[PDB]
């Protein structure tokens, strides 16, 4: 109990007025945590498309898309980082129980999506790819995020992904946001002397 | 290119407002996509680069 | 776009709801399972013991 | 009916025997129990409810809100409990009107 | 300490941390130190013109 | 007694004269007379004092 004489931690339910006369419990509250269930698909006045569902898949690369581990104590992503979940299933393990991961993606790519999303005003779900990394054509079958784009498990794929004729053929691409490409990184050993003064 | 051409004149600072060069055509051109693939190839084969 | 949120008192009985209340009204209320003699007493007695 | 619980509070005051209730009126929210009186009811606290309202708002990330209240009991504290709960947090949510 | 408010150690807490809180208590009638003038503190105390 | 002032707990209650809490108005009225804004308040810990 509490000093007033009410129970200290009484069980409680979050309830909403469903269409017409129904009281449907949107969610339930257990202990400290707040359980919110999206019982109604739209909180809007009856429109369904809303922001188009845009499940997006990405992969981690620095600086552009950085996966960071969220504070355990400071629950859930903090500030700028946006959540990205991949079911953490040991691929090797046959069971491969997959619980979506809780690592927060953040960076230039994420920031661009965040900025573009506001103008677009379409809500979206973000997760991480498991198989194939950057899209790859091996034998007769593609791999990576492109697979989830083809399987329609991803509508749009975001990342450090480069552009090529094959992928432009299979899927429409956005205009490029950063000048990049193939390049070399080396150590510069020495300088040449010419007596020409 | 002009900066090279004279050298009496110079370019300074850091390029701002970066942009890509792409052909302009009237909408719905059924070729623009192919063109895009073609110039893509021009980059891929080093043609664009060679030029 | 405006939305309303309510404490326990306004909801009152689940069965009665003047439709004067707007739809999408969000409010908190006690658990249906909790609201049974079965457990409130089971619990209360346990507390007594 | 809400009044039955209050009568029972009086009874607690009268006989000093513990009494509690699991449903209905005994369950409803009541005036802060006089310390001498002994009494248990299954009614959620106003402050707790306000907290849940805040948690609900936080979950949907509705930062900006107002409170419309009436002179009905617990209105002043409701503001106080909210002030503390809203105030403590780093976030810049806005109370528009009371 | 110079002084900073701490939000949630048990119940919500004030800007009673270190030297600054001492002042709030009324134990100290004046703070004479290299105390930085800032918005956070100015909301609760009076700062002279900067020395 | 002041505890009857809260409409919530006693909603039918009316009285001929003001509570001890309302007496502060006099004390406040008293303040007009001394033309002092600074005073000290000592209260017991009860519903009447906090009110």
Task: Describe this protein's structure.
With 197 residues, chain A is of the alpha+beta class. Chain A is built from three helices and eleven strands. Chain A has helices spanning 108-120, 145-150, 165-170, and strands at residues 12-17, 23-30, 33-34, 55-58, 66-69, 82-84, 103-106, 125-128, 136-138, 141-143, 156-157. The relative contact order of chain A is 0.14. With 51 residues, chain B is an all-alpha fold. Chain B is 43% helix and 0% strand. Chain B contains three helices and no strands. Chain B has helices at 2-6, 32-44, 47-50. Chain B is elongated and about 45 Å long. Classes of the chains: A alpha+beta (197), B mainly alpha (51). Chains in contact: A-B, A-C, A-D, C-D, D-E, D-F. The interface between A and C is medium-sized, with 17 and 19 residues.
Q: How far from one another are the termini of chain A?
A: 93 Å
Largest sheet of chain B: none
What is the chain-wise order of helices and strands of chain B? HHH
Total helical segments of chain A: 3
- Secondary-structure element series of chain A: EEEEEEEHEEEHEH
Largest interface: pair, residues per side? A-C, 17 and 19 residues
Count of DSSP strands of chain B: 0
- Total number of beta strands of chain A: 11
Q: What kind of sheet is the major sheet of chain A?
A: 3 strands, antiparallel
Rounded radius of gyration of chain B (Å)? 16 Å
Helix content of chain B: 40-55%
Percentage of residues in strands of chain A: 15-25%
SS content category of chain A: alpha+beta
């Amino acid at each position: 109990f509490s000093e007033d004489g009410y129970q200290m931690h009484p069980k409680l339910v979050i309830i909403l007025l469903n269409q017409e006369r129904k009281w449907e419990r949107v969610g339930k509250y257990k202990d400290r945590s707040l359980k919110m269930w999206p019982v109604f698909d739209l909180y809007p006045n009856s429109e369904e498309h809303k922001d188009e569902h845009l499940s997006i898949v990405t992969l981690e690369e620095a600086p552009f898309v950085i996966v960071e581990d969220v504070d355990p104590l400071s629950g859930t992503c903090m500030r700028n980082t946006v959540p990205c979940r991949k079911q953490i299933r040991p691929e090797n393990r046959t069971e491969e129980g997959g619980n979506y991961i809780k690592r927060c993606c953040k960076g230039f790519c994420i920031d661009i999506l965040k900025k573009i999303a506001k103008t677009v005003k379409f809500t979206y779900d973000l997760y991480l790819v498991t198989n194939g990394k950057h899209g790859k054509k091996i034998n007769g079958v593609w791999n990576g995020m492109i697979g989830e784009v083809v399987t329609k498990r991803a509508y749009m794929a975001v990342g450090s992904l480069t552009i090529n004729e094959e992928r432009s053929e299979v899927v429409d691409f956005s205009v490029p946001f950063i000048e990049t490409g193939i390049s070399v990184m080396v150590s510069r050993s020495n300088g040449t002397v010419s007596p020409s003064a | 290119f002009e900066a090279s051409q004279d050298c009496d004149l110079v370019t300074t600072g850091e390029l701002f407002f970066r942009s890509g060069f792409g052909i302009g055509m009237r909408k719905d051109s059924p070729w623009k996509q192919e063109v895009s693939l073609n110039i893509l190839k021009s980059h891929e084969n080093g043609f664009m680069e060679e030029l | 776009g405006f939305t309303w949120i309510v404490p326990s008192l306004v909801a009152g009985d689940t069965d009665t709801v003047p439709d004067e209340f707007p739809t999408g009204l969000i409010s908190v209320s006690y658990d249906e399972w909790d609201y049974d003699l079965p457990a409130r007493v089971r619990d209360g007695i346990a507390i007594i013991t | 009916q809400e009044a039955i619980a209050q009568i029972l509070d009086f009874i607690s005051v009268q006989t000093l025997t513990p009494i509690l209730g699991i449903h209905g009126g005994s369950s409803m929210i009541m005036a802060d129990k006089e310390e001498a009186s002994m009494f248990f009811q299954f009614g959620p606290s106003i402050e707790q409810q306000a907290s849940v309202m805040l948690n609900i708002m936080e979950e949907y990330d509705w930062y900006i809100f107002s409170i419309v209240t009436t002179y009905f009991p617990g209105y002043q504290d409701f503001e106080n409990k909210v002030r503390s709960t809203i105030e403590n947090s780093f976030v810049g949510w806005e109370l528009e009107e009371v | 300490k110079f002084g900073t408010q701490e939000r949630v150690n048990n119940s919500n807490a004030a800007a009673w941390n270190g030297m600054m809180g001492e002042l709030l208590s009324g134990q100290a009638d004046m703070i004479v130190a290299p105390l930085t003038i800032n918005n956070e503190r100015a909301q609760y105390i009076e700062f002279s013109k900067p020395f | 007694m002041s505890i009857y002032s809260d409409k919530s707990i006693h909603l039918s209650f009316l009285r001929t004269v003001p509570p001890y809490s309302h007496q502060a108005l006099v004390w406040f009225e008293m303040m007009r007379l001394f033309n002092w804004n600074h005073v000290i308040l000592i209260v017991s810990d009860d519903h009447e004092g906090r009110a």
